[PDB]
Every structure is written in C-alpha cells, then in structure tokens.
Amino acid sequence: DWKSSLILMAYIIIFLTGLPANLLALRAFVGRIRQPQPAPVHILLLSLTLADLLLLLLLPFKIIEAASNFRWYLPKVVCALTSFGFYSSIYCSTWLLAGISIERYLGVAFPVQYKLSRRPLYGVIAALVAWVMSFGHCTIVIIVQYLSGNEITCYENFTDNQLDVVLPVRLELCLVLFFIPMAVTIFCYWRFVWIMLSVGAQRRRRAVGLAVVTLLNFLVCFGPYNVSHLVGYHQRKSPWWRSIAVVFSSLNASLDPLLFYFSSSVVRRAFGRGLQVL
Ligand SMILES: C[C@]1(C(=O)N(CCCC(=O)O)Cc2cccc(Cl)c2)CCN1C(=O)c1csc2ccccc12
C-alpha cells in the first residue's frame, strides 16, 4: 500500500521535476539553434531530450498503475505499445551518451580532425544510427514476447518454451545495448578528463561534471535494470525487484537535464532566464 504509494509519488516528482526542465531544455536547444547549429554535439543532445520527452510523457501511466496495485487490465496491443515506448528511450539514450563520449574526446583531444570536420552533417548520422539501432533491436523484443483477476497490469507468464527464446534476447540487448556502450563511455571519458586535467576552472568543472553524470547514469540509473535481466539466467524467473529497478531507469530523466547544463552554456543562459522568471 504505502510501499506502492511511495513509487507513485516518486514518479510524480520525476514527472513534475523533469518535464518542465526537459521542455525548457528542448526550447533551449531550439533557441541555441539560432542559425541551425553547426556543432555535431548540439544535435546529438537534442535527440536525448526527445528520447527523454518520449519517456516522460508516457511516465504518468506508471503513477496510475502504482495507485491501483497494477489492477487495471490493458489490451495486449496497448501493453506492447507502452513497453516499446520505454525500451526505445533507454537503449537510444545509452548509444547517444556513448556518441557524446565519442564527440567530446574526438572533438577536444586530437582537435586537428575537429577543425576540418566542424560541419554538423557528419554528426547527424550518429543520432540516426542510435535511433535505428534502438528501434530495430527493441522491436524484436515485442515481436517475440507478444505474438483471470490477478494483481498484475501485464502478467508475464509467457511459456516454458518461450522462456528459452525470450531470455537470450533480453541478454542480447543487455550486452549489446548497454555493456558495450559502457566499455566505450569509460574509455573515452577516462582520456577526455586526463586531457582536460593536463574560465579554465569553469571548463574543468563542466568537463568533470559531464563525465561524472554520464558515469553515474550507467551505474545508478541503467545498471540495476540491466543486471536484473542477467539475473534471469541464474533464477529462470523474473526478479521481484524489477519494478524497483524500473524506478532507476526513469530517474535518469531527472539527471539528464544536468548534462545539458554542463555541456552547453546557452542552456545555462536559458535556465538562467527561466530561473529569473521563476
Ligand atoms: C514496467 C514495464 C512493463 O512494461 N510492464 C511490467 C510488467 C508487470 C510487472 O511485473 O510489474 C508492463 C506494463 C507496465 C506499465 C504499463 C503497461 Cl501498458 C504495461 C517493465 C519495463 N516496462 C516498460 O517497458 C514500461 C511500459 S510503460 C512504462 C512507463 C515507465 C517506465 C517503464 C514502462
């Protein structure tokens, strides 16, 4: 009861804290465009904002669930659409954050290439690759898993045979769409921070802060969910703390705003104006 209510209120907080800041971020980038940005970084970040918006706008469904002890029964189609809605955002975000890690390292360190390739169009493909990879692979999940008065919004008994097909797919996504980005993100930022270490204080604090946020996201926000998938092999059963792990997956949407503040000064100016009003 209260155990459920807490997640409801936490999700409301995430919604009511996130959505305004994310809309302000979206507007900030739309502002930062001025003449459509020449910078590949600013495009990739915009995609993350859209991926966040996609999640945050669909987030309220969860607060409604948490009230009703996951009772209200949704059609299998609706259940699938909402599930796909979530999956897309997370695994898109991971590759985008990896793309940012690439961008900062390759951009700042070894700047000769960045001086020549300061055109925006070379960047756009990375966002499209992230979207295509996310959508394309995530679709497989809902294909496989989809085509009574129990306390479950979507009870996932599946089938004993299907289990043997389903879990490998979840592990495949877990590995390729997270554990690989993880290996890239840390490899880039470890160097980027070293290069930055080797206005200056502001640049340093921005650069470190950026890396801290990206690291934190993978461990705190995305970690437990992707661990919970892997535990699937050990237990051969959906862990009870999946619903808890999901909280963290949503939490990212609250901390992603900071990324934009640390990255782009225009966002700091825009939030400055927003804070001036508020
Ligand atoms: C919550 C969950 C899901 O879809 N379930 C959970 C099974 C039941 C269990 O065991 O609690 C069914 C479900 C949950 C909710 C709505 C529908 Cl219509 C169907 C699992 C990750 N995920 C989403 O992809 C997700 C979908 S909307 C959304 C919003 C925010 C975060 C994540 C999500």
Numbering used by the authors: 4 to 150, 158 to 208, 318 to 397
Manuscript excerpt for this entry:
We then purified FFA2-BRIL in the presence of the antagonist GLPG0974 and coupled it with the anti-BRIL antibody BAG2. The resulting complex was further purified by gel-filtration chromatography, vitrified, imaged, and the structure was determined at a nominal resolution of 3.36 Å. GLPG0974 is accommodated within the extracellular binding site, but surprisingly, there is no overlap with the TUG-1375 binding site. While the binding site of TUG-1375 is mainly formed by TMs 3-5, the binding site of GLPG0974 is mainly formed by TMs 2, 3, and 7. Thus, we term this binding site of GLPG0974 as allosteric site 1. Moreover, GLPG0974 binding induces a conformational change in Y903.33, the tyrosine residue dividing the two binding sites, causing it to be pushed towards the TUG-1375 binding site. However, in the GLPG0974-bound structure, due to the conformational change induced by GLPG0974, Y903.33 collapses the space for the binding of the carboxyl group of TUG-1375, presumably restricting the accessibility of both synthetic and endogenous agonists. The antagonist forms a cation-π interaction with K652.60, which prevents the formation of the cation-π interaction between K652.60 and F893.32 that stabilizes the active conformation.
The free fatty acid receptor 2 (FFA2) is a G protein-coupled receptor (GPCR) that selectively recognizes short-chain fatty acids to regulate metabolic and immune functions.
